[PDB]
Coordinates of C-alpha atoms and ligand atoms in Angstrom, one line a residue:
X3 CA 0.0 0.0 0.0
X4 CA 2.3 2.7 -1.2
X5 CA 1.8 6.4 -1.6
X6 CA 0.0 8.1 -4.5
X7 CA -2.6 10.7 -5.3
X8 CA -5.8 8.6 -4.8
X9 CA -8.4 8.7 -2.1
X10 CA -6.8 6.0 0.0
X11 CA -3.1 6.8 -0.5
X12 CA -3.0 10.6 -1.4
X13 CA -1.7 13.7 0.2
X14 CA -3.9 13.5 3.3
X15 CA -2.4 10.1 4.1
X16 CA 1.2 10.8 3.6
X17 CA 2.0 11.9 7.2
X18 CA 1.5 8.3 8.4
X19 CA 4.6 7.1 6.6
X20 CA 6.3 10.5 6.5
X21 CA 5.5 12.5 9.6
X22 CA 7.4 15.5 8.3
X23 CA 4.4 16.1 6.2
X24 CA 3.0 18.2 9.1
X25 CA 6.4 20.0 9.5
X26 CA 7.4 23.6 9.7
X27 CA 8.5 24.2 6.1
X28 CA 6.4 22.0 3.8
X29 CA 5.7 22.7 0.1
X30 CA 3.9 23.8 -2.0
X31 CA 2.3 27.0 -0.6
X32 CA -0.1 29.6 -1.9
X33 CA 2.0 32.7 -2.9
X34 CA 0.0 35.7 -1.7
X35 CA 1.4 38.3 -4.1
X36 CA 0.5 41.3 -2.1
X37 CA 2.2 39.9 1.1
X38 CA 5.4 38.7 -0.6
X39 CA 8.1 41.3 0.2
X40 CA 10.3 42.8 -2.6
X41 CA 13.9 42.1 -1.5
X42 CA 16.3 44.5 -3.3
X43 CA 19.2 42.4 -2.0
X44 CA 18.1 39.3 -4.1
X45 CA 20.3 38.7 -7.1
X46 CA 19.2 37.8 -10.6
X47 CA 18.9 34.1 -11.0
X48 CA 21.7 32.6 -13.1
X49 CA 20.5 29.7 -15.2
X50 CA 23.5 28.1 -17.2
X51 CA 22.0 25.2 -19.1
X52 CA 24.2 25.3 -22.3
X53 CA 26.1 22.1 -21.6
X54 CA 23.2 20.1 -20.2
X55 CA 23.2 16.4 -21.0
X56 CA 19.9 14.7 -20.8
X57 CA 20.2 10.9 -20.5
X58 CA 16.8 9.1 -20.0
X59 CA 13.0 9.6 -19.4
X60 CA 11.1 7.4 -16.9
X61 CA 7.4 6.9 -15.9
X62 CA 7.8 6.1 -12.1
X63 CA 4.0 5.8 -11.5
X64 CA 3.8 9.3 -10.0
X65 CA 5.0 11.5 -12.8
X66 CA 7.5 11.3 -15.7
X67 CA 11.0 12.5 -15.2
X68 CA 13.9 13.4 -17.5
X69 CA 17.2 12.6 -15.8
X70 CA 20.5 14.4 -16.6
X71 CA 24.2 13.6 -16.4
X72 CA 25.0 15.5 -13.2
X73 CA 28.6 14.0 -12.7
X74 CA 30.2 17.3 -13.8
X75 CA 29.4 21.0 -13.8
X76 CA 27.1 21.1 -16.8
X77 CA 23.7 22.6 -16.2
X78 CA 23.8 24.7 -13.1
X79 CA 21.7 27.2 -11.2
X80 CA 23.3 29.9 -9.0
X81 CA 22.6 33.5 -7.8
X82 CA 19.1 34.5 -6.9
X83 CA 18.7 33.6 -3.2
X84 CA 21.3 30.8 -3.4
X85 CA 24.8 30.6 -1.9
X86 CA 27.0 28.4 -4.2
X87 CA 26.3 26.3 -7.3
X88 CA 23.4 23.8 -7.8
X89 CA 23.6 20.9 -10.5
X90 CA 20.5 20.0 -12.5
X91 CA 19.6 16.4 -11.9
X92 CA 16.1 16.0 -13.3
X93 CA 12.9 17.7 -14.3
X94 CA 9.3 16.5 -14.1
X95 CA 5.8 17.9 -14.0
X96 CA 2.6 17.8 -12.0
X97 CA -0.7 18.4 -13.9
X98 CA -4.5 18.1 -13.6
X99 CA -7.4 16.3 -15.1
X100 CA -8.7 19.7 -16.3
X101 CA -7.0 22.9 -17.2
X102 CA -8.2 24.7 -14.0
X103 CA -6.0 22.6 -11.7
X104 CA -2.7 20.8 -11.8
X105 CA -0.1 23.2 -10.3
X106 CA 1.3 22.6 -6.8
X107 CA 2.0 26.2 -6.0
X108 CA -0.8 28.7 -6.4
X109 CA -0.7 32.5 -6.9
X110 CA -3.4 34.4 -5.0
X111 CA -5.2 31.0 -4.9
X112 CA -5.0 30.6 -8.7
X113 CA -4.2 27.1 -9.9
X114 CA -2.4 26.7 -13.2
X115 CA -2.9 23.7 -15.5
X116 CA 0.5 22.2 -14.6
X117 CA 3.9 22.9 -13.0
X118 CA 7.4 22.1 -14.1
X119 CA 10.0 21.3 -11.5
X120 CA 13.7 21.5 -12.4
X121 CA 15.5 19.9 -9.5
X122 CA 19.1 20.9 -8.6
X123 CA 21.4 19.9 -5.8
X124 CA 24.1 21.9 -4.0
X125 CA 27.5 20.8 -5.1
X126 CA 29.0 21.5 -1.6
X127 CA 27.2 18.2 -0.6
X128 CA 28.7 16.1 -3.4
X129 CA 25.6 14.0 -4.4
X130 CA 21.9 14.5 -4.5
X131 CA 21.1 12.0 -1.7
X132 CA 23.5 13.7 0.7
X133 CA 22.1 17.1 -0.4
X134 CA 18.6 15.9 0.4
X135 CA 19.6 15.6 4.1
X136 CA 20.6 19.3 4.3
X137 CA 18.3 22.4 4.9
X138 CA 20.0 24.1 1.9
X139 CA 20.6 20.9 -0.1
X140 CA 18.2 21.3 -3.1
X141 CA 16.9 24.2 -5.2
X142 CA 13.9 23.7 -7.4
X143 CA 13.0 26.1 -10.2
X144 CA 9.2 26.0 -10.5
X145 CA 7.5 27.1 -13.7
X146 CA 3.7 27.3 -14.2
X147 CA 2.1 26.1 -17.4
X148 CA -1.1 27.6 -18.8
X149 CA -3.0 26.3 -21.8
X150 CA -3.0 28.4 -25.0
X151 CA -0.3 28.4 -27.7
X152 CA 2.1 25.5 -27.9
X153 CA 5.6 25.5 -26.4
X154 CA 7.8 24.3 -29.3
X155 CA 10.6 23.3 -26.9
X156 CA 8.3 20.9 -25.1
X157 CA 7.3 18.9 -28.2
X158 CA 10.3 16.5 -28.1
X159 CA 9.2 15.4 -24.6
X160 CA 5.5 15.0 -25.4
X161 CA 6.3 13.0 -28.6
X162 CA 8.0 10.2 -26.6
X163 CA 5.4 9.8 -23.9
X164 CA 3.6 7.0 -25.8
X165 CA 6.8 4.9 -25.2
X166 CA 6.6 5.2 -21.4
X167 CA 2.8 4.9 -20.9
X168 CA 2.8 2.8 -17.8
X169 CA 4.7 2.7 -14.5
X170 CA 8.3 1.4 -14.7
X171 CA 8.8 2.1 -18.5
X172 CA 11.9 4.2 -19.5
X173 CA 13.7 5.2 -22.6
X174 CA 16.9 6.8 -23.8
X175 CA 16.4 10.6 -24.1
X176 CA 19.5 12.4 -25.2
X177 CA 20.1 16.0 -26.5
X178 CA 17.0 17.5 -24.9
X179 CA 17.7 21.2 -24.2
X180 CA 15.8 22.5 -21.1
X181 CA 16.4 26.1 -22.1
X182 CA 13.4 25.6 -24.4
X183 CA 11.1 25.2 -21.4
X184 CA 11.9 28.6 -19.8
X185 CA 9.7 31.8 -20.0
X186 CA 11.2 35.2 -21.0
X187 CA 11.5 36.6 -17.5
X188 CA 13.4 35.1 -14.6
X189 CA 11.6 37.3 -12.0
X190 CA 10.7 35.0 -9.1
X191 CA 9.4 34.3 -5.7
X192 CA 11.4 32.3 -3.2
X193 CA 10.9 30.7 0.2
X194 CA 12.3 27.7 2.2
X195 CA 10.4 24.5 1.7
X196 CA 10.3 20.8 1.0
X197 CA 9.9 18.1 -1.5
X198 CA 6.3 18.0 -2.6
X199 CA 6.3 14.2 -2.8
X200 CA 7.3 11.6 -0.2
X201 CA 9.8 11.5 1.5
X202 CA 8.9 15.2 1.9
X203 CA 12.4 16.2 3.1
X204 CA 12.7 19.8 4.2
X205 CA 15.8 20.5 2.1
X206 CA 14.5 22.8 -0.8
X207 CA 15.0 26.4 -1.6
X208 CA 12.0 27.1 -3.9
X209 CA 12.4 29.5 -6.7
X210 CA 9.0 29.9 -8.5
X211 CA 9.0 32.0 -11.7
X212 CA 6.3 34.6 -12.0
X213 CA 5.8 34.3 -15.7
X214 CA 4.1 31.1 -16.9
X215 CA 4.9 29.2 -20.1
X216 CA 2.0 28.5 -22.5
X217 CA 1.5 24.9 -23.7
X218 CA -1.2 23.8 -26.1
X219 CA -4.2 21.6 -25.3
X220 CA -2.7 18.9 -27.5
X221 CA 0.5 18.9 -25.5
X222 CA -1.2 18.6 -22.1
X223 CA -3.6 16.0 -23.6
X224 CA -0.5 13.8 -24.1
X225 CA 0.5 14.2 -20.4
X226 CA -3.1 13.0 -19.5
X227 CA -2.7 9.8 -21.6
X228 CA 0.0 8.5 -19.2
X229 CA -1.0 5.8 -16.7
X230 CA -0.3 5.6 -12.9
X231 CA -0.6 1.8 -13.1
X232 CA 1.9 -0.7 -14.4
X233 CA 1.0 -2.6 -17.6
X234 CA -1.7 -5.3 -17.0
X235 CA -3.1 -3.6 -13.9
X236 CA -6.4 -1.7 -14.1
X237 CA -6.0 1.5 -16.1
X238 CA -5.9 4.7 -14.0
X239 CA -4.8 7.8 -16.0
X240 CA -2.0 9.8 -14.6
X241 CA -3.8 13.1 -13.8
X242 CA -4.1 15.2 -10.6
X243 CA -0.6 14.2 -9.4
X244 CA -0.3 17.4 -7.4
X245 CA 0.0 18.1 -3.6
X246 CA -2.3 21.0 -2.5
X247 CA -0.9 24.1 -0.8
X248 CA 0.4 23.5 2.8
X249 CA 0.4 25.9 5.8
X250 CA 2.9 28.7 5.4
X251 CA 3.7 28.7 9.2
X252 CA 6.6 30.9 10.2
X253 CA 7.8 31.7 6.6
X254 CA 8.2 34.8 4.5
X255 CA 8.0 34.6 0.7
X256 CA 10.4 37.1 -1.0
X257 CA 10.0 38.6 -4.4
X258 CA 12.9 39.4 -6.7
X259 CA 10.8 42.1 -8.5
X260 CA 8.5 45.2 -7.8
Ligands
LIG1 N1 8.2 17.7 -6.5 S1 9.7 18.2 -6.1 O1 9.6 18.8 -4.7 O2 10.3 19.0 -7.1 C1 10.6 16.7 -5.9 C2 10.1 15.5 -6.1 C3 10.7 14.3 -6.0 C4 12.1 14.3 -5.6 C5 12.9 13.1 -5.4 O3 14.1 13.1 -5.5 C6 12.1 11.9 -4.7 S2 13.1 10.5 -4.2 C7 14.1 11.0 -2.8 N2 14.1 12.2 -2.3 C8 14.8 12.6 -1.3 C9 15.6 11.7 -0.6 C10 15.6 10.4 -1.1 N3 14.8 10.0 -2.2 C11 12.8 15.6 -5.5 C12 12.0 16.8 -5.6 CL1 12.8 18.3 -5.3
LIG2 ZN1 7.7 18.2 -8.4

């Protein structure tokens, strides 16, 4: 009876296996735009993805993820609220059954159709597992998706999803450039938080971009054809794989803009 997004194993159940679910710095959160404080000391975010090396794409029964070669300084995040250099290790998405839900973070209670998470680890900790045990171990760049015009840079991802329909399928996935998933502006909100999936470790500096990307209905339709289940099990479409907003508690959200 493992964790998921259903009625009997979804977010309201996760605290039983992972008591940190009720912790002091859980994610996602609602970003109340009027309450976030503009911090003039925040630096521009530096996103250096020119030498990224994608390796593989995998349906793990919770999402799909593109994994990168993170064994050298390739695709790195720095600046912004961060101290030091963070290596990109994977990206994945969360999305809805309908376009009015799917994001994890919300902005003045607005839900987007999906959210992209680009997961990076602090190189001072040597590997992603070690980094996950530190309060400043990971940095996730979060990008909202709205439905409208297509994102051309996402098409290579959506076109291979039919090859990883069910849980446990993977494929080779080289030469994918994550720069094609970014909006024009790198203005952001930031706060200290957690993984949004089990094990829910409190190790993430969240950097959530203010500007969404647009993707087409046909692109998000292909996300919704994935399956949570393994092949041969009853078919349950992979939709609504998002954790709702959690209590902000004793945290401030800072804005890089305004
Ligand atoms: N949604 S999210 O918060 O961006 C997110 C989701 C899953 C993972 C994983 O690495 C899960 S496996 C794992 N995590 C920490 C320690 C041992 N294993 C990492 C992140 Cl940052
Ligand atoms: Zn995520």
